Amino acid sequence: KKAIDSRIPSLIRNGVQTKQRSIFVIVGDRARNQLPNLHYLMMSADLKMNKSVLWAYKKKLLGFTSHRKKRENKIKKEIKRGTREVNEMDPFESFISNQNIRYVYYKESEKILGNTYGMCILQDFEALTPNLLARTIETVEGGGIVVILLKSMSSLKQLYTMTMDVHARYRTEDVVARFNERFILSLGSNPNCLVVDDELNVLPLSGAKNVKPLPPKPPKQLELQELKESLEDVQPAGSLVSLSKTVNQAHAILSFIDAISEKTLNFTVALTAGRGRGKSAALGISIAAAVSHGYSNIFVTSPSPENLKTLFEFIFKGFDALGYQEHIDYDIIQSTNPDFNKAIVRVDIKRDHRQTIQYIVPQDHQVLGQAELVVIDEAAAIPLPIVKNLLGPYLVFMASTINGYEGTGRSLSLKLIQQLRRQLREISLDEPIRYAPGDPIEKWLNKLLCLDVTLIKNPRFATRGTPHPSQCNLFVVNRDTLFSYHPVSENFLEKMMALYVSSHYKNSPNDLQLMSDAPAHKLFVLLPPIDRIPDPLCVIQIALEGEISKESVRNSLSRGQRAGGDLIPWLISQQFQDEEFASLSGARIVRIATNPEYASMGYGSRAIELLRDYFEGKFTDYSIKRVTLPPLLLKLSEQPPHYLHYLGVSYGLTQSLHKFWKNNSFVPVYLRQTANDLTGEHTCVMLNVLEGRESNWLVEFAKDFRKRFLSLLSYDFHKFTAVQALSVIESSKKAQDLSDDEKHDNKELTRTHLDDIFSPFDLKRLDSYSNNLLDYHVIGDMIPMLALLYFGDKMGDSVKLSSVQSAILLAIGLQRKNIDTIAKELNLPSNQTIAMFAKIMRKMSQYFRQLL
Amino acid sequence: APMSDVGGVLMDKDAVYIDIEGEKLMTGLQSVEQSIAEKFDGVGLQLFSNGTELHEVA
RNA sequence: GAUGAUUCAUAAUAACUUUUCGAAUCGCAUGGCCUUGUGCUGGCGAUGGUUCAUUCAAAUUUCUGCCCUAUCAACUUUCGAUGGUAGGAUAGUGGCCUACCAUGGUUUCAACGGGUAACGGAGAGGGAGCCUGAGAAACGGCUACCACAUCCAAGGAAGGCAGCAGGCAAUUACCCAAUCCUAAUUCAGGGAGGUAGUAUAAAUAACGAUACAGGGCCCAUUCGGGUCUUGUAAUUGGAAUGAGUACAAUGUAAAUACCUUAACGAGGAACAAUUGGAGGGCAAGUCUGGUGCCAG
RNA sequence: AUACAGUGAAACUGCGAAGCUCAUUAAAUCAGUUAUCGUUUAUUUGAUAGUUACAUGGUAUAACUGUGGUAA
Ligand SMILES: [Mg+2]
Ligand SMILES: [Mg+2]
Ligand SMILES: [Mg+2]
Ligand SMILES: [Mg+2]
Question: Cα(A399)–Cα(A443) distance, rounded to whole angstroms?
Answer: 24
Identify the helix (H) or strand (E) that includes residue A35: helix A35-45
Note whether A359 and A346 are within 8 A (CB).
yes
A278 annotated binding-site participant: yes
DSSP A787: H
CB-based contact A633 B35, cutoff 8 Å: no
Q: Looking at the complex, does the CB of residue A210 fall below 8 Å from at least one CB of chain B? A: no
C101 C1' – A779 CA distance, angstroms? 93
Q: Looking at the complex, does the CB of residue A532 fall below 8 Å from at least one CB of chain B? A: yes
Q: Using omega within 30 degrees of 0 as the cis cutoff, is the peptide bond preceding A236 cis?
A: yes
CB-based contact B47 A533, cutoff 8 Å: yes
Residues comprising chain B, all counted: 58
Experimental method: cryo-EM
Closest CA to A488 of B43, B34, B36: B43
Helix/strand/coil (H, E, C) string of A392-406? CCCEEEEEEECCCCC
Question: Cα(A123)–Cα(A482) distance, rounded to whole angstroms?
Answer: 28
CB-based contact B14 A166, cutoff 8 Å: no
Question: Cα(A487)–Cα(A186) distance, rounded to whole angstroms?
Answer: 11
Note whether A826 and A818 are within 8 A (CB).
no
Closest CA to A334 of A319, A302, A312: A312
Query: Where are any strands of DSSP class E within A94-220?
Result: 101-105, 117-122, 140-149, 193-197, 202-203
CB-based contact B51 A628, cutoff 8 Å: no
What Rg value do the Cα atoms of chain A yield, rounded?
A: 32
C292 C1' – A233 CA distance, angstroms? 93
> CB-based contacts with strand C under 7 Å?
A 61, 66-69, 102-105, 111, 341
DSSP A120: E
A70 beta carbon < 7 A from strand D? yes
C21 C1' – B41 CA distance, angstroms? 101
Q: Of chain A residues 288-317, which have a CB less than 8 A from chain B?
A: none
**Torsion from C-alpha of A807, A813, A819, A825, nearest 10 degrees:** -30
Question: Cα(B50)–Cα(A587) distance, rounded to whole angstroms?
Answer: 29
Closest CA to A307 of A284, A288, A286, A290: A284
Question: Cα(A240)–Cα(A220) distance, rounded to whole angstroms?
Answer: 19
CB-based contact B30 A628, cutoff 8 Å: no
Q: Which nucleotides of D are covered by protein (CB under 7 A)?
A: 68-72
Using an 8 Å CB-CB cutoff, list chain B residues near A150: none
C47 C1' – A81 CA distance, angstroms? 39
Q: Which nucleotide is nearest to A101 (CA to C1')?
A: C153
A118 annotated binding-site participant: no
Residue A612 C-alpha, separation from nearest chain B C-alpha, in angstroms: 22
Q: Is A580 exposed, middle or buried (0-12, 13-18, 19+ CB in 10 A)?
A: exposed
CB-based contact B18 A37, cutoff 8 Å: yes
Question: Cα(A122)–Cα(A134) distance, rounded to whole angstroms?
Answer: 12
Question: Cα(B55)–Cα(A665) distance, rounded to whole angstroms?
Answer: 43
Question: Cα(A131)–Cα(A434) distance, rounded to whole angstroms?
Answer: 19
A673 beta carbon < 7 A from strand D? no
Question: Cα(B58)–Cα(B51) distance, rounded to whole angstroms?
Answer: 17
Residue B41 C-alpha, separation from nearest chain A C-alpha, in angstroms: 9
Closest CA to A644 of A565, A540, A546, A722: A546
Resolution in Å equals 3.2
Question: Cα(A779)–Cα(A762) distance, rounded to whole angstroms?
Answer: 9
**Helix, coil or strand: residue A190:** coil
Note whether A503 and A552 are within 8 A (CB).
no
Q: Which nucleotides of C are covered by protein (CB under 7 A)?
A: 151-155
Q: Looking at the complex, does the CB of residue A228 fall below 8 Å from at least one CB of chain B? A: no
* CA pseudo-torsion sign A695, A697, A703, A705: negative
- The count of C-alpha atoms lying within 13 angstroms of the C-alpha of A196, restricted to the half-sphere facing its C-beta, is 30
| Cα-based distances in Å from A592 to A43, A489, A497, A607 | 50, 21, 12, 9
